[PDB]
Design a protein around this ligand. Structure first.
Ligand SMILES: [As]
Ligand SMILES: [As]
Ligand SMILES: [As]
Ligand SMILES: [As]
Ligand SMILES: [As]
Ligand SMILES: [As]
Ligand SMILES: [As]
Ligand SMILES: [Zn+2]
Ligand SMILES: [Zn+2]
Ligand SMILES: [Zn+2]
Ligand SMILES: [Zn+2]
Ligand SMILES: [Zn+2]
Ligand SMILES: [Zn+2]
Ligand SMILES: [Zn+2]
Ligand SMILES: [Zn+2]
Ligand SMILES: [Zn+2]
Ligand SMILES: [Zn+2]
Ligand SMILES: [Zn+2]
Ligand SMILES: [Zn+2]
Ligand SMILES: [Zn+2]
Ligand SMILES: [Zn+2]
Ligand SMILES: [Zn+2]
Ligand SMILES: [Zn+2]
Ligand SMILES: [Zn+2]
Ligand SMILES: [Zn+2]
Ligand SMILES: [Zn+2]
Ligand SMILES: [Zn+2]
Ligand SMILES: [Zn+2]
Ligand SMILES: [Zn+2]
Ligand SMILES: [Zn+2]
Ligand SMILES: [Zn+2]
Ligand SMILES: [Zn+2]
Ligand SMILES: [Zn+2]
Ligand SMILES: [Zn+2]
Ligand SMILES: [Zn+2]
Lengths: 104, 104, 104, 104, 104, 104, 104, 104, 104, 104, 104, 104, 104, 104
């Protein structure tokens, strides 16, 4: 039910956070490309799981993805990675119904 | 069905944009409280319309409101207004399924 | 009718009381987050039930959660849990039309 | 329609705040009954206005009065006034749909 | 006009009398809790009907309810039930304009 | 089954072709904006139908929409409309399994 | 799982890009013929791998192939090569779920 | 195993023969278009069944279709229908391992 | 009573698996401590049962508990939970005489 | 009734931690005096609860107190407070079966 | 009965004190190692005796062992030996019900 | 009931008086040590009996012990034994409700 | 609760210490009677308070009084006062659960 | 109520009379020690019953006990028993409100 949706959001975030980790030792120049590559893989699995376990969540997920890709797409190379991460995490919190979408 | 939801988003944005306008001629130190006052009024109408025309949209609307209010709540006085507007416009675009949630 | 609303309030309280129970053995420093996690799950179900059985109750419900969450949000770590429970218990009683909103 | 409700909430708060003012110079031991006397008068007008301009608001209003009245009713003489004001302020904010029901 | 008010009083009394009936078999230590539970349910319906059919009657209904609840609230456990019933039946008769408010 | 998917593709194309029609009498400067506005409305309905009738089709649909919007997004104002239409019809044909994706 | 599909897309693209390379030194009029010959070989392997590792991907792959062969099939000799490459790269991006299907 | 493949070939032929039937009462100039439309629908179902029951059969099936659509594609309007039917029937017999691929 | 020992191992595993379940919706940074809290409770009961039903099993049990607590103790916050579960799972299998201590 | 023991340990620690808090803004030389007074009060309640809910815990509890009181008793005035706290905290952890009795 | 427990505590202390003796002429950097080796041997015997003569004492014994091993585990090499001895001696006194757990 | 408590007091005194007897021949300097050793043994049994037969008596018993160990603890070596005996016997008489707590 | 008992012990000690004060300026021969007279008055009040606030404390209190009166009763005139004070302060400390019953 | 007090007096007297009976066959020299021993046991039970059933009776009871003990305390060995019995019965009769406190 609505449980499936929650769990999937957890997975997505996990994949997201893991891809971010891949960026640890890569130089700024390659950070976005590195993260992006790692994330694209795990994302598809997540999206597929959604398609069969919680279809209503698919378009929402597509929206957060789009939000991050588009933000980075229009940002200067140097800001792309940060632009994506920032918009993705907030967008995901919104989709999740999390009240504090900004920070601590 | 889904049309009602779209229309309501339009209304919300309209109320939002109008309240922002109330802020035009005021000095920065006041812009937030002025905007907030004007927006609180029109918001309630919008939320009520949602409750009877598209209930599923209510909790979402609540999330985009909380996004904005909470962002401003934790911001320095000088940034509150901008913090609210920025987070509100984006959160609403996300809820609307608008792909470009950042800017032009 | 108005019966649906009553029943939903019962459910909400049940979810609330159950999440509180989850806090049984965790040391004070974790009680809040633990409770928060358990409650966020069950809350969504309740809110969804409201959306289809008693929409007018949704905005009221969104109010109590905010009431509670905001109270804890501004409280010192040590008081957050108690701040939330206290304000949630009362806000729900108010929404329910219960005359004695404080205690025994 | 929802405008009438907002306006009435403003009036109620106004009556409330004014009665509190009556408590300005009275010695702590008589503050509550002094306040109580002043507030009982203005309340009736407000309630009547509600009955003809926004009936749905009446039961909500009767609720918040009972909330404040009952809290003070069970408090020690020395705490009655504060108990009433605190619970009334918050109950009214809840009924108004105000997200921050506690403080600044 | 005034017919609606009469009918509503009938309904209230009916709900009252029915809840009292719920108390039939229960022993003298539970009668109040049992009665209270049964009555709280039916009351809300009645109050809601009043809000839309005869709003002026709402605050009055609130007064008779309070009379009864408050009377029992300050009574010893053993007397609570009787205190409530006695004060409720009379308060309702008064609100109804019934000349013999005491007994046969 | 796979029938639902086919039908939905038909609907999408229909909405697309209709929005294009909205453009016949507008000169260059307004063509994209106009089309975009008309299409955004009908698209949401289609996407919603997909979410409940053929979820696997959602991400594919998100793709063609993405294909089209992005192509126009990076095109000079004068070419945006044509860029969108061209990429949309082809992407849709691909998603539909239509062998001749270019023209005749 | 969905990983197999991703990997196969990578392989396909690799075979594609390699065949394109074969065209590096042939004069325009032979570029297509040359490319076509080199690509036909490697394609079969890729398609076979799909048949056993990710069957659902086969019909999609067939589409992309058809997309390009058909585009070139109807193009003037001088444009055939470019027609194939353009349509193949985009069709593959669509099948891959790549949002930017056009260019940099 | 190999039974599934046989059965699917039967289905395909059935769909093919049925679509041909749709062409009976229409005049030649309309035969092809009509047949094509009817066949495109049923084909997709068949192809999908193949994807999950006998993947190795997919590329083969894609060959008969290709063979047919391409034969008609290059034929004069008047011959298209016959060109398709002739090539489809034979290609399918070849794929089926039927020794007499021409006629009786 | 080698039976008693077996049964106790079952209980321990049950308590373990249940505590893990408590970790179901809590964010990762909290999983370990949430799990730890839930497990510490049920563990004591199990250990006490061992003390009176199968004393020889007590020191073994303290060993698998130590194995897990120590593994997590020296792990980075992010790995603690996984470190504990992995080592506990295996250590218990070893103590149980289970030949496949790793996985499937 | 091992649950009762756990709960009591929680209470004891709570009383302990609270008394420590009483020491916050008092000058060092005043610390111990203050803490001791606050703690002696709450301790008795805890011990009494133990006497009726978990008697076996009483002598253990008397051991931690003796531990702490005696440690401070033999310490120089300047070290008494720290001597008590240090020994009390560890002794309680030992009695609780907590493996890490020293620190983090 | 309780005699067995006392005797076992004596044995444990004896083993402990003997192992300490082994540390007699070993250079400081080697003291903890040496002691640990000697103590691990004798400890097992003691623990086994407990398992059959006084099982309830086993879990307690594991606690004082864990107290000492953990204290040294987190101490700088130079302090490990002293950390272990200090925490072991006290933890054992606590388990024994000895009132003066610190020194004299 | 209260009988159990009386009997236990008798036992305690018996253990006490017996330990004192152990001191019969040892010279003054060692007298306290000797007595202490003998008494510590028998005391534990008595305390355990109390824990299961009369828990309320445990904390009282701890008081008498404490009273005696503390009195001797602060006495000069030469007076320790006498200090303990005197305070123990009197403290025990007080706990027993014996009116003449001093002598004959 | 157990709080009442504590408070009463405080009162008793206060009355005791106050009566002692009455003795400051009286020479030996009159000291006991003076103290005795002053104490007998205040004692009764204390005992009465106990009878209604903490009955279980009465017999204990009777014990401490008995200890003091009896000790003095058998002492030479010159020692009576000191005999009473000494035995009373200790007996009261015992009844209070105070560990150091002798001095500092 | 006052009944409880009466009943307790009956019990006390019964215990008293029974202890006296224990004295039937012992020689004068042991009479008082025999009676005293038997009575001390049963007295405690009675006093405890008073503490929970009729607290106001405790101090009175304490007072008669004291009357009898003290009378015997100051009597020659040969008269102790008779001194106690005589004063106890009369004292008890007085406490009971019995008019003839001397004899028949
Ligand atoms: As942002
Ligand atoms: As409050
Ligand atoms: As009355
Ligand atoms: As193109
Ligand atoms: As491992
Ligand atoms: As230490
Ligand atoms: As003494
Ligand atoms: Zn863009
Ligand atoms: Zn932000
Ligand atoms: Zn916040
Ligand atoms: Zn942004
Ligand atoms: Zn806030
Ligand atoms: Zn409150
Ligand atoms: Zn009340
Ligand atoms: Zn508050
Ligand atoms: Zn009241
Ligand atoms: Zn009355
Ligand atoms: Zn782009
Ligand atoms: Zn094209
Ligand atoms: Zn073609
Ligand atoms: Zn293109
Ligand atoms: Zn062709
Ligand atoms: Zn041919
Ligand atoms: Zn370690
Ligand atoms: Zn490992
Ligand atoms: Zn000491
Ligand atoms: Zn330490
Ligand atoms: Zn550690
Ligand atoms: Zn120490
Ligand atoms: Zn001391
Ligand atoms: Zn003495
Ligand atoms: Zn005497
Ligand atoms: Zn002394
Ligand atoms: Zn005397
Ligand atoms: Zn006499």
């Amino acid at each position: 039910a609505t449980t499936e949706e929650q769990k999937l959001i957890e997975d997505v975030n996990a994949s997201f956070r893991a891809a971010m980790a891949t960026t640890a030792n890569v130089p700024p120049a390659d950070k976005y490309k590195t993260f992006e590559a790692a994330f694209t893989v795990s994302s598809k699995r997540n999206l597929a799981d959604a398609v069969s376990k919680a279809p209503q969540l698919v378009p929402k997920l597509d929206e957060v993805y789009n939000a991050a890709y588009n933000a980075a797409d229009h940002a200067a190379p140097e800001d792309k990675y940060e632009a994506f991460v920032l918009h993705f995490s907030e967008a995901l919190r919104i989709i999740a119904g999390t009240p504090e979408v900004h920070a601590v």
